[PDB]
Amino acid sequence: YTRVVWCAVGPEEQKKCQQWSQQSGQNVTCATASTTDDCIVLVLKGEADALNLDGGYIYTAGKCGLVPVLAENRKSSKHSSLDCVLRPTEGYLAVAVVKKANEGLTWNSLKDKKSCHTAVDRTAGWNIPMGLIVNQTGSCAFDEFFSQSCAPGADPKSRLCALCAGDDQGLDKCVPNSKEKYYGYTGAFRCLAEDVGDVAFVKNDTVWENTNGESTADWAKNLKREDFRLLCLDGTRKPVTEAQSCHLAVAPNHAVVSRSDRAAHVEQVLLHQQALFGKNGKNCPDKFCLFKSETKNLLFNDNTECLAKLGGRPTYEEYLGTEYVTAIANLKKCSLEACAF
Ligand SMILES: *[C@@H]1O[C@H](CO)[C@@H](O[C@@H]2O[C@H](CO)[C@@H](O[C@@H]3O[C@H](CO)[C@@H](O)[C@H](O)[C@@H]3O)[C@H](O)[C@H]2NC(C)=O)[C@H](O)[C@H]1NC(C)=O
Ligand SMILES: *[C@@H]1O[C@H](CO)[C@@H](O[C@@H]2O[C@H](CO)[C@@H](O[C@H]3O[C@H](CO)[C@@H](O)[C@H](O)[C@@H]3O)[C@H](O)[C@H]2NC(C)=O)[C@H](O)[C@H]1NC(C)=O
Ligand SMILES: *[C@@H]1O[C@H](CO)[C@@H](O[C@@H]2O[C@H](CO)[C@@H](O)[C@H](O)[C@H]2NC(C)=O)[C@H](O)[C@H]1NC(C)=O
Ligand SMILES: CS(=O)(=O)Nc1ccc([N+](=O)[O-])cc1Oc1ccccc1
Ligand SMILES: [Fe+3]
Ligand SMILES: [Zn+2]
Ligand SMILES: [Zn+2]
Numbered sequence: 001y002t003r004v005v006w007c008a009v010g011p012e013e014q015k016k017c018q019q020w021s022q023q024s025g026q027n028v029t030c031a032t033a034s035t036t037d038d039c040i041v042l043v044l045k046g047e048a049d050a051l052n053l054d055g056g057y058i059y060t061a062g063k064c065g066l067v068p069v070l071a072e073n074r075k076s077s078k079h080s081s082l083d084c085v086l087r088p089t090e091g092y093l094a095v096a097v098v099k100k101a102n103e104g105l106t107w108n109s110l111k112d113k114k115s116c117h118t119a120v121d122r123t124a125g126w127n128i129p130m131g132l133i134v135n136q137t138g139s140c141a142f143d144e145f146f147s148q149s150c151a152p153g154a155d156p157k158s159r160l161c162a163l164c165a166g167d168d169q170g171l172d173k174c175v176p177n178s179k180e181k182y183y184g185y186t187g188a189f190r191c192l193a194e195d196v197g198d199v200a201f202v203k204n205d206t207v208w209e210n211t212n213g214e215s216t217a218d219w220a221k222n223l224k225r226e227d228f229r230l231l232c233l234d235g236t237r238k239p240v241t242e243a244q245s246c247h248l249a250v251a252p253n254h255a256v257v258s259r260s261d262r263a264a265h266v267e268q269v270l271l272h273q274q275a276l277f278g279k280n281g282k283n284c285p286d287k288f289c290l291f292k293s294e295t296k297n298l299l300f301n302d303n304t305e306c307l308a309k310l311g312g313r314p315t316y317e318e319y320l321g322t323e324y325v326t327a328i329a330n331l332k333k334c335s336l337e338a339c340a341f
Contacts, residue, residue, distance in 0.1 A: 004269045007031045007039035007048040008299065010177030016298045020277070023288040028273060035176055040064065041341055043259060050258040050266045052300050055123040055320055059328050061257050062316025064339035069267050070307040071255040071319075072300060074205070084279070084306035085271070093204040093247040094124035096231040097192060097240070105198060107231045114163060115146045116191035116200035118184050119176045120153030123251040123324075125188060129201045131331040132233070132248060140334035150191055152176040152183045163196050178296065186210065186295060190219050199231065203251065204243040205303055215295045249327075252320050254301060255310075270307055279305050 006021075008014040008030050017030040031048040033039040040061050042048040050069065053061065058068060071089045079087045098105050105113070110133075118125025130142045137145070143160060153176040154160035165181040166173030174180060182191040185206040192200035193210075209215060211225040229237045232246035258266040276282050277290035284290070291304045300307075310319065317325055329336075 001027075001268075002265065004028050004049045004266055005031050005047070006299070007033060007042055007051040009033060009036050009039055009051075010175075010179050012178045012293075012296065013298045016293055019288060020290065020299075023277070023283065024273065027269065037176075037341075040066070043257070044341065046259070049262055050256050050270075052254055052256045054254050055252045055324065056121045056127050056328070058252075058255055058257060058316055059320055059325065060121065060340060062320075064341060065260060066257045066316070067260045067263050068255040068310060068314060068316055068319045069258055069263050070270060071253045071310060072304040073253065073308040074301075074303050074305050085308050086311075087308060089253045089308060091250045091252055092124070093243050094128045094201070094249045094251050095204050095207070095240075095243055095247050096129065096199050096201055097189070097207055098199050098229050098231060098237075099192070099195065100227050100229050102198060105231075106235050106237060107233055108235050110199065110231075111145060112147045113198040114196070115149040115151070116163070116182060116188040116197035117149060117151040117160075118188045118202060120151050120160075124185075124203045124248075125201050126151065127328055127331060128249045128251065131327045134331060134334060142334065150174070150180075150182045150188075150197065152180050152187075163191065165196075178298065185297060185301075193219060193223055201248075204230075204240070204247065207240045209295065209303065217295055220295075249324075252324060255319065256307060267309075271309075274307055278307075 006017055006028055008017040014030060014032040021029045031042055033042055036057050039051050044064055073084055073089055076090050120126050133145055134142055148162035149160050150163035151160040152174050156174045161174035164174040167179045172179050182188060185202045188200045188202050189206050189210055191197045207228060210220045211223040225240055228240050230240055230246045232238060238246045277284045277288050291300050293302055
């Protein structure tokens with residue numbers, strides 16, 4: 001039992017983290033970086049212990065020796081009697097969404113359109129969609145497929161950032177952190193919702209969580225589920241109720257990572273931390289809820305029921321799965337063995 005230093009990405013995550021530190025009796029304390037990549041580095045240097053990551057980053061960090069410790073787990077149906085922490089992870093659905101009013105727009109007519117990506121290097125926002133697109137066009141010029149986009153992490157003065165709005169002052173345009181208006185699952189969807197982009201690459205849950213009154217956010221309060229459509233790969237368009245049969249791929253859940261030599265300790269702390277601030281924790285909603293940040297998915301996705309033990313003591317390659325790891329590899333060829341830092 002020593003303190004665990006969590007790594008927060010951006011001003012908003014550091015704010016939520018300090019609260020968490022406050023309530024934990026400093027059993028958990030924070031470190032901050034303007035980028036996920038930066039936070040990965042802090043964890044290598046040993047200046048930070050852990051952070052929750054998207055599959056795409058789990059792959060970057062894995063190459064540098066970091067290891068998955070616990071994964072996020074949401075509501076399910078299968079394995080009913082099984083507890084949340086012991087229940088296997090179901091993965092999530094990567095989808096392409098568009099406005100229903102935008103008739104005629106299909107998977108086959110995306111070229112030269114305007115896109116909304118969660119952030120460069122992420123599973124549903126970048127890797128899956130651009131990987132399919134490169135494949136399909138047999139070209140690495142994915143920087144010229146769309147006319148304009150908002151893909152946080154790309155060159156600020158390039159097309160891939162043309163649609164990004166930066167923060168409330170216009171500062172930090174395209175930064176890969178919640179300070180970018182159109183960053184992440186929620187940002188990318190708002191990007192489509194305000195008709196800045198023609199399509200948004202997010203996960204199916206994002207569409208449900210921000211429509212039909214589920215989100216009290218000004219931009220989403222009058223958003224209606226029937227006004228959106230999913231682009232399937234067979235060229236069709238289906239209601240967002242057919243996600244199970246109209247997705248680009250199923251992605252591995254976001255997971256908490258740490259250096260291998262710190263994984264056991266980080267694991268210990270977090271199980272006890274969610275026992276206090278988890279879904280039905282002792283001090284939630286009473287004092288602090290670890291999985292609530294208000295439709296902003298800070299540190300953890302707001303739809304996380306609990307952090308689950310992995311089991312099978314998976315290497316980062318086995319956690320992400322073999323089909324996904326190859327997808328990432330082939331895409332990386334465009335822009336084999338070596339830590340990127
Ligand atoms: C797409 O995402 C949406 C939401 O992220 C998912 O839909 C949801 O379906 C689940 C389970 O089928 C519902 O969760 C339920 O909780 C209730 C508690 O009252 C419980 O009775 C059930 O056992 C269930 O776990 C949930 O209400 C519903 N979400 C919303 C916001 O309507 C869906 O799983 C995803 N679909 C695909 C194909 O990925
Ligand atoms: C884009 O097209 C890519 C090439 O066709 C494709 O990459 C391939 O990924 C699959 C599955 O991960 C691999 O195919 C393999 O077939 C069976 C089933 O997975 C394996 O047991 C075999 O060993 C074999 O590897 C390919 O290895 C891989 N292609 C290359 C060049 O290595 C991507 O999956 C496609 N991208 C998307 C998003 O679908
Ligand atoms: C801070 O961490 C410590 C270690 O988990 C917690 O103190 C423990 O309290 C439990 C409850 O009975 C005991 O089982 C342990 O023996 C205690 N640890 C020791 C030996 O110091 C404490 O609960 C944590 N505080 C918060 C708010 O998270
Ligand atoms: C068993 S593992 O280490 O968790 N990797 C893995 C996980 C999931 C899937 N899949 O297709 O859903 C596929 C996976 O790997 C392979 C895919 C195609 C052929 C052989 C292995
Ligand atoms: Fe993701
Ligand atoms: Zn599928
Ligand atoms: Zn194994």
